[PDB]
Design a protein around this ligand. Structure first.
Ligand SMILES: Nc1ncnc2c1ncn2[C@@H]1O[C@H](COP(=O)(O)OP(=O)(O)OP(=O)(O)O)[C@@H](O)[C@H]1O
Ligand SMILES: Nc1ncnc2c1ncn2[C@@H]1O[C@H](COP(=O)(O)OP(=O)(O)OP(=O)(O)O)[C@@H](O)[C@H]1O
Ligand SMILES: Nc1ncnc2c1ncn2[C@@H]1O[C@H](COP(=O)(O)OP(=O)(O)OP(=O)(O)O)[C@@H](O)[C@H]1O
Ligand SMILES: Nc1ncnc2c1ncn2[C@@H]1O[C@H](COP(=O)(O)OP(=O)(O)O)[C@@H](O)[C@H]1O
Ligand SMILES: Nc1ncnc2c1ncn2[C@@H]1O[C@H](COP(=O)(O)OP(=O)(O)O)[C@@H](O)[C@H]1O
Ligand SMILES: [Mg+2]
Ligand SMILES: [Mg+2]
Ligand SMILES: [Mg+2]
Ligand SMILES: [Mg+2]
Lengths: 261, 250, 51, 65, 186, 241, 52, 101, 267
């Protein structure tokens, strides 16, 4: 099912910006060919984890109705080739049949290396898997019909090679959600679970400025614990007020505010 | 990175060449391409200015400051080191030659006094070398037109032609091909513009380009006419309009 | 340079071919040899050529 | 300076000397500020110098400009 | 005092109130990790808490059950995981994580990977609102900076507890505990 | 690194210390604005409204250094105060030394020279504040001189400072091209303030109350701060948008 | 060394020594019967000894 | 470095002009002989710096005959070939220095 | 490079026509004709140094030659050589040279060597020792590699003093090419010409104004400009790019920093 484009908040703006990049060359490589430019393939996404870069990749895929392959590479991570060799070969073959198709290459950096020169010798073994993938998806060939979107979450494990042109064409920002984009998100969460009627969020969102959306779910759950502790199955507006303060502390302490290269 | 001996300026470096002094040169390179050409009957100094912010006024950024009315200076490098060094040059000169010998310095003497200041910001530990290398171009009676370089080390040398900054390589060779000292000044100004024009071609408008000559006296700019014997100012800074005239002569 | 050829000849060829002559006529036997001088002289070549 | 002239009375030696010493500081001022100093600026600087020695330095001057 | 109050929120209360958790629908705490200086009684706490929750207390260590070869033992561990989930309710106490942490690039692809992966599986399956309430997970480690990077992604351990330095009050009480054993000297 | 700490030349030969000061001067997040009207120099800065534990009015970023000369400060407050002393002090000393009011241009030059001395001093850590002098100058009329923490200084037709400086600049640039001059339109001192207030609101997108601004105005022979309520007179027409 | 210092610190590193070390710590630490077992440890320096 | 068992040491200079004449002569014979026999001139006029240098002269002089689609060299070619090889050796090696002393 | 070969041909090379000529003579022709060299009797041209900073299309040149040689092309990187077991590196040097002999003619191309070749080293790190050993064996093998059908080692660098200059030097590397990146008018003009060919342009503004305004702009800057230009062209439904659209696209991209971003803080 499409992740509801209304329930993406504070990054409304991101969805619309995106289809310029993606929808026009995916449906018709014809227009960019006649225009006179090499058709673009390779798009790099980047935002502090929990802003929903993955979530945005999905949002766009449903609209077009294009086939969707989400592959985390952190679920199969290994040194030398093993299980990865089997998967990636299979995975391009499925993508080719279901074309037009988008591969959301999630945590590309996982099997991503760093070049080193005196470093750990093992990290270069890891790097090789990533290079094998790259050639299968596209060789010398440039297609828009099958296209690759690369998403990173740690930037210092990210491959210096994969930054370069010829592997990459756009470097698309995905920024923090908005101030009252965060409010939209806060309200959605609490509608889903039980509540007696809560409207103390006007205050609560302000303290919880700078939050990843992932982190907003965490103050809502803890508020909810507080309700069950009180012997209620309804979050009271009092409980929510309690939660946001304590959750704000850790959140910024241990916070990811990095934007990957 | 480097040694704790080479960061120190009270400590003989292993190599004997400080790390410090070498940093000062890296910075000179990073700055503007400034040049000097010596002529029979003049010296021309010319440079491009930083574009800076769009709404920052360009005029106020001055990379040619007159030390005396008859002797100007040009540098590559940072603004702050430039201004402080410049107040020190004038000030030490007044004491040691405008009250003693009650007259403007020979160019050689002024150049000598500028090296000494430089030298002291390299001798004393914990005080970094001046961030700037000069050309001091000038005119005095005794030794005619003269052209100098003063290094942040505190060594100085006269030249026929020198250029400094990123485009130093380019410029020096161009001057050689096209010119020699025996040629007149008028030719060199057109030449110098062209040389600097390799450097940058997006804008070469006379707003962003500061061009001056030290040459003949101007008895008008003496400013207390009716006495002729006093030399007028040797230096005359050429306005943007004047540059533009000199661009259609190229 | 042939300067060089006589100097290297004495040192390697005679003790290898006949240690028995060298030992007796001289005293002891020569050891390792270190070739020094700039790159690109063709020192490697010399080493191949004797062999 | 070119447009600040004065004529000196008093002890002759002092009048030349003070003009030379002060001269430099005025010249220093001019260049420092990229602006022609005020007539009053010369006046002020001149006044303090003399004042210190309570007038033994005996320059009495008409300052014009 | 503080850590006890915190552990009891994460553990005891959800165990008994499990119906309430289902209704509202929010996840119950999927495991608590305790870390920082030894001697703070990581051990101890878990034993007392399990007893209150009446839930079978396994005291366990993930690389210790690797016996000899990592062939016959990687497999032993897959059985141990299976056993431990079954016969719920339970709180499995898994200890020191440092040997299988391996944040390095020279992270073994050997059988050391298998123990580690089955660690991710245990935690993932608890998510929901029914699986969190039966099967509870405690974990103990000293250095927290050497861990697997997929562990710092998502909420693999749903609660992270840092020990604070002891206070005056804390010292004075621990002394009393020791001194009672001895003859009372006023 | 040791390389970060040394006050003496870095291996790069461009100081790490200098880049750091530049970081600092955006911790407070004060967007300020200074423009040159025809015969009036307007400076505006956000007046934060903290909790009641502090009075709001007292909190300020616009300071009266001397007659005509005002100073807007961007970057941390305790260092602001340190700097402030030296500039007030010299304006006085110049008046004693030279028997005439100090011009704007000369005060900025003095402070660039002090900035550079700071990195030659081992003990001292360089001040990490922006000093922007505004005045109706003696000769030059409306004048804006912006001084950097490093010690670079440059004059301005108009300027803004902050992390959100970029948006404001664009409006001011295009405005000046359409108007085909460098002065904000209208001889009247009052309506130029209002054109500044308005342009601040646009760029930032946030309507500011009288509570959220402070307006310092330069005329001939005084720099003075307007009342809270004066600000409002402008604000009201603008506020319905 | 071996059941003494960790060799994790190294670039490629090693942890066969962490296995040996670990086992000993847990036998000592917590409940576990003992038949009047004295524990003597010979280290040349306490520094080398794992702080654990 | 320290005593041990190393004892014999043979020092090799970079060529002299005499030695340079010899190396140059014998490669030219195998290849195509320098006509007007000004291979002796080339060695007398200048010193290279290596015998590696000298084999580079040999290659280039021969490449000059190739551009014309000739298969024999002359003196005119060696005079061009030497200036190119030898001068290039100096411009790569000098760039490292700034302006010290 | 022959199993699946590049689409880069000498025709697809636009600008650098002057640099391009020398590189074919040196490299491609020993391999296609041994016979030419034998008739005069010269030693074949040796290695070729490619330097010029990236955007000078060093790799691009070798992509061209890869098609035409019809014959082996071995494209390897510096990464392979530096440690993979803390001991792999010395072995790895030997295998590329051997592998070349088997499938001769071959082009040996090493992309990075700026980090393998250093004047000084540190033997205290154990891992570094292998870096040192790779450099020394390469010097040795090259002397035993003369008078072979394989072209003598070709390598690409940012700079010619990263390599030791005394050791790695003319007559190993007798051609050492500097690429124009400051660039002349002609050189610029040819790069614009690759684009001008690719799609018709509707004249709406001076073509040559754009050339003059580019101070030194490299090939990569010029490709990027077109890429933006055409993104706007999709929306409009234009299929022949206005010369006005390129002009505004240049205006928004005044690359190589210009003055506006370098000058802003080196003041
Ligand atoms: N005298 C010579 N005659 C023939 N060719 C020569 C001569 N000297 C050098 N060369 C050429 O130079 C090439 C490289 O020189 P070589 O590596 O043998 O030098 P080396 O002085 O022993 O250096 P290194 O410092 O590398 O050990 C040789 O393979 C050969 O083609
Ligand atoms: N909080 C406590 N109060 C009193 N005694 C304590 C306390 N914590 C630990 N000790 C004492 O120290 C002994 C050893 O505990 P130990 O140092 O193994 O602590 P831990 O926090 O469980 O660490 P780890 O398992 O990482 O070694 C206990 O058996 C107990 O007697
Ligand atoms: N006290 C000593 N005993 C023996 N020989 C000595 C003594 N002192 C000096 N020598 C002289 O040094 C000569 C060479 O010694 P050699 O170099 O074999 O010795 P080492 O100290 O065992 O070193 P290395 O194995 O590093 O070469 C001997 O043949 C002898 O002439
Ligand atoms: N734009 C958003 N709208 C709603 N919730 C959000 C948003 N951004 C983040 N989240 C919440 O955080 C969860 C986890 O982020 P995830 O999709 O894993 O992103 P990333 O790839 O950036 O780590 C999302 O599934 C969603 O529940
Ligand atoms: N002849 C040319 N025509 C077009 N663009 C060129 C040309 N030569 C080089 N370039 C540009 O140079 C950049 C680099 O080319 P590449 O072969 O990847 O090598 P490197 O960065 O190693 O020199 C590309 O962006 C390419 O557009
Ligand atoms: Mg993801
Ligand atoms: Mg050799
Ligand atoms: Mg314990
Ligand atoms: Mg390359």
């Amino acid at each position: 099912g499409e992740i509801t484009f209304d329930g993406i908040g504070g990054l409304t703006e991101q969805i619309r910006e995106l289809r310029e990049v993606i929808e026009l060359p995916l449906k018709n490589p014809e227009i960019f060919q006649r225009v006179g430019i090499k058709p673009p393939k390779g798009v790099l996404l980047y935002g502090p984890p929990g802003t929903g870069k993955t979530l945005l990749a999905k949002a766009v895929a449903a609209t077009i109705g294009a086939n969707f392959i989400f592959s985390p590479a952190s679920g199969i991570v290994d040194k030398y080739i093993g299980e990865s060799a089997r998967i990636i070969r299979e995975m391009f073959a499925y993508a080719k049949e279901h074309e037009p198709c988008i591969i959301f290459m999630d945590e590309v950096d996982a099997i991503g290396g760093r070049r080193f020169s005196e470093g750990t010798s093992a990290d270069r073994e890891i790097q090789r898997t990533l290079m094998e993938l790259l050639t299968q998806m596209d060789g010398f060939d440039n297609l828009g019909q099958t296209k690759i979107i690369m998403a990173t979450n740690r930037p210092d494990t990210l491959d210096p090679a994969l930054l370069r042109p010829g592997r990459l064409d756009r470097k698309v920002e995905i920024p923090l959600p908005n101030e009252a984009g965060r409010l939209e998100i806060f309200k959605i969460h609490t509608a889903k679970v039980k509540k007696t009627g809560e409207f103390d969020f006007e205050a609560a969102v302000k303290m919880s400025d700078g939050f990843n959306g992932a982190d907003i779910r965490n103050c809502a759950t803890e508020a909810g614990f507080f309700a069950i502790r009180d012997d209620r199955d309804h979050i009271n507006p009092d409980d929510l007020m309690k939660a946001v303060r304590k959750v704000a502390e850790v959140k910024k302490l241990e916070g990811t505010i990095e934007y990957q290269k | 990175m480097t040694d704790r001996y080479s960061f120190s300026l009270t400590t003989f470096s292993p190599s004997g060449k400080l790390g410090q002094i070498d940093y000062a040169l890296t910075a000179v390179k990073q700055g503007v391409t400034s040049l000097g050409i010596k002529a029979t009957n003049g010296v021309v100094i010319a440079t491009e200015k930083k574009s800076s912010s769009p709404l920052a006024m360009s005029e106020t950024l001055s990379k040619v400051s007159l030390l005396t009315p008859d002797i100007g200076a040009v540098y590559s490098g940072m603004g702050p080191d430039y201004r402080v060094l410049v107040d020190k040059s004038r000030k030490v000169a007044h004491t040691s030659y405008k009250r003693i010998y009650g007259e403007y310095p020979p160019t050689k003497l002024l150049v000598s006094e500028v090296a000494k200041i430089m030298q002291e910001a390299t001798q004393s530990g914990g005080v970094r070398p001046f961030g700037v290398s000069l050309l001091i171009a000038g005119h005095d009676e005794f030794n005619g037109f003269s052209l100098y370089q003063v290094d942040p080390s505190g060594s100085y040398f006269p030249w026929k032609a020198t250029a400094i900054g990123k485009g130093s390589v380019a410029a020096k060779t161009f001057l050689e091909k096209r010119w020699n000292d025996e040629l007149e000044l008028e030719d060199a100004i057109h030449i110098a513009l062209l040389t600097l024009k390799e450097s940058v071609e997006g804008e070469f408008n006379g707003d962003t380009i500061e061009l001056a000559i030290i040459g003949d006296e101007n008895p008008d700019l003496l400013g207390y006419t009716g006495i002729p014997t006093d030399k007028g100012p040797r230096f005359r800074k050429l306005t943007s309009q004047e540059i533009n005239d000199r661009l259609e002569a190229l | 340079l042939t300067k060089q050829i006589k100097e290297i000849k004495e040192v390697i060829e005679l003790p290898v071919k006949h240690p028995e002559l060298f030992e007796s006529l001289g005293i002891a036997q020569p050891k390792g040899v270190i070739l020094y001088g700039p790159p690109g002289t063709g020192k490697t070549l010399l080493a191949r050529a004797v062999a | 300076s070119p447009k600040i002239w004065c004529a000196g009375a008093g002890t002759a030696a002092d009048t030349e000397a003070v003009t030379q010493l002060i001269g430099s500081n005025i010249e220093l001022h001019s260049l420092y500020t990229s602006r022609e100093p005020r007539v009053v600026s010369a006046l002020q600087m001149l006044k303090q110098h003399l004042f210190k020695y309570q007038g033994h330095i005996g320059a009495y001057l008409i300052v014009a400009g | 005092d503080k850590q006890i109050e915190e552990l009891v929120e994460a553990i005891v209360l959800p165990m008994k109130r499990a119906d309430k958790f289902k209704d509202m629908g929010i996840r119950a705490p999927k495991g608590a990790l305790m870390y920082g200086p030894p001697g703070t009684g990581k051990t101890l706490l878990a034993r007392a808490c399990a007893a209150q929750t009446n839930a079978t207390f396994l005291k366990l260590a993930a690389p210790q059950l690797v016996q000899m070869y990592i062939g016959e033992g990687a497999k032993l561990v897959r059985d141990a995981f299976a056993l431990a989930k079954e016969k719920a309710p339970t709180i499995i106490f898994i200890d020191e994580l440092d040997a299988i942490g391996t944040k390095r690039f020279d992270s073994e692809k050997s059988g050391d990977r298998e123990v580690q992966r089955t660690m991710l599986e245990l935690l993932n399956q608890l998510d929901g609102f029914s699986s969190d309430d039966r099967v509870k997970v405690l974990a103990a480690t000293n250095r927290v900076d050497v861990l697997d990077p997929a562990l710092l992604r998502s909420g693999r351990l749903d609660r992270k507890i840092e020990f604070p330095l002891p206070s005056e009050d804390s010292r004075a009480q621990i002394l009393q505990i020791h001194s009672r054993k001895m003859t009372t000297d006023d | 690194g040791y390389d970060r700490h040394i006050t003496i030349f870095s291996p790069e030969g461009r100081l790490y210390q200098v880049e750091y000061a530049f970081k600092a001067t955006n911790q407070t997040n004060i967007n300020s604005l200074a423009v040159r009207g025809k015969d009036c120099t307007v400076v505006i800065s956000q007046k934060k409204v903290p909790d009641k534990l502090l009075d709001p009015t007292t909190v300020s970023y616009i300071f009266c250094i001397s007659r005509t000369i005002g100073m807007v400060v961007n970057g941390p407050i305790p260092d602001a105060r340190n700097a402030a002393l030296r500039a007030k002090a010299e304006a006085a000393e110049f008046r004693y030394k030279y028997g005439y009011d100090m011009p704007c241009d000369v005060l900025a030059k003095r402070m660039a020279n002090l900035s550079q001395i700071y990195t030659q001093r081992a003990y001292m850590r360089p001040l990490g504040v922006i000093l922007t002098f505004v005045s109706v100058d003696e000769e030059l009329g409306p004048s804006i001189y912006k001084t950097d923490p490093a010690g670079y200084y440059v004059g301005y037709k108009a300027t803004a400072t902050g992390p959100k400086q970029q948006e404001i600049t664009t409006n001011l640039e295009n405005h000046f091209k359409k108007s085909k001059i460098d002065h904000i339109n209208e001889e009247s001192w009052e309506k130029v303030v209002e054109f500044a207030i308005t342009h601040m609101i646009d760029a930032l997108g946030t309507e500011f109350s009288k509570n959220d601004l402070e307006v310092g105005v330069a005329t001939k022979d005084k720099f003075f701060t307007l009342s809270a309520e004066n600000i409002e007179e402008r604000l009201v027409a603008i506020a319905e948008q | 060394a071996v059941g003494g210092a960790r060799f994790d610190d190294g670039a490629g590193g090693d942890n066969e020594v962490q296995r040996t070390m670990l086992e000993l710590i847990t036998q000592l630490d917590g409940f576990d019967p003992r038949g009047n077992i004295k524990v003597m440890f010979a280290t040349n320096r306490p520094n080398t000894l794992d702080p654990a | 470095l320290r005593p041990g068992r190393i004892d014999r040491k043979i020092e090799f200079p970079p060529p002299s002009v005499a030695a340079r004449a010899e190396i140059l002569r014998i490669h030219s014979r195998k290849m195509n002989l320098t006509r007007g026999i000004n291979l002796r001139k080339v060695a007398e006029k200048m010193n290279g710096c290596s015998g590696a240098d000298v084999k580079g002269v040999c290659t280039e002089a021969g490449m000059y005959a190739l551009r014309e689609r000739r298969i024999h060299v002359t003196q005119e070619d060696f005079e061009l070939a030497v200036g190119k090889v030898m001068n290039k050796n100096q411009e790569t090696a000098i760039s490292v220095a700034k302006l010290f002393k | 490079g022959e199993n699946e070969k590049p689409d880069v041909t000498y025709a697809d090379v636009g600008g650098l026509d002057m640099q391009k000529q020398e590189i074919r003579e040196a490299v491609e022709l020993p391999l296609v004709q041994a016979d030419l060299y034998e008739q005069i009797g010269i030693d074949p041209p040796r290695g070729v140094l490619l330097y010029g900073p990236p955007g000078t299309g060093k790799t691009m040149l070798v992509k061209a030659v890869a098609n035409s040689t019809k014959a082996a092309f071995i494209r390897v990187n510096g990464s392979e050589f530096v440690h993979k077991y803390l001991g792999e590196g010395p072995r790895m040097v030997r295998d590329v040279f051997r592998l070349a002999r088997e499938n001769a003619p071959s082009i040996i191309f090493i992309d990075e060597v700026d980090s393998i070749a250093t004047k000084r080293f540190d033997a205290q790190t154990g891992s570094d020792r292998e870096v040192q050993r790779i450099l020394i064996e390469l010097l040795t093998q090259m002397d035993g590699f003369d008078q072979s059908t394989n072209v003598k080692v070709i390598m690409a660098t940012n700079r010619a003093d990263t390599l030791d200059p005394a050791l790695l030097r003319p007559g190993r590397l007798d051609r050492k090419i500097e690429f124009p990146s400051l660039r002349d008018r002609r050189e610029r003009r040819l790069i614009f010409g690759t684009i001008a060919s690719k799609m018709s342009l509707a004249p709406e503004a001076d073509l040559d104004s754009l050339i003059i305004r580019n101070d030194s702009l490299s090939g990569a800057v010029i490709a990027a400009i077109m890429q933006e230009a055409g993104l706007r062209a999709v929306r409009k439904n234009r299929y022949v790019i206005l010369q006005s659209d390129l002009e505004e696209a240049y205006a928004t991209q005044v690359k190589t920093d210009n003055t506006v971003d370098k000058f802003d803080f080196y003041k």
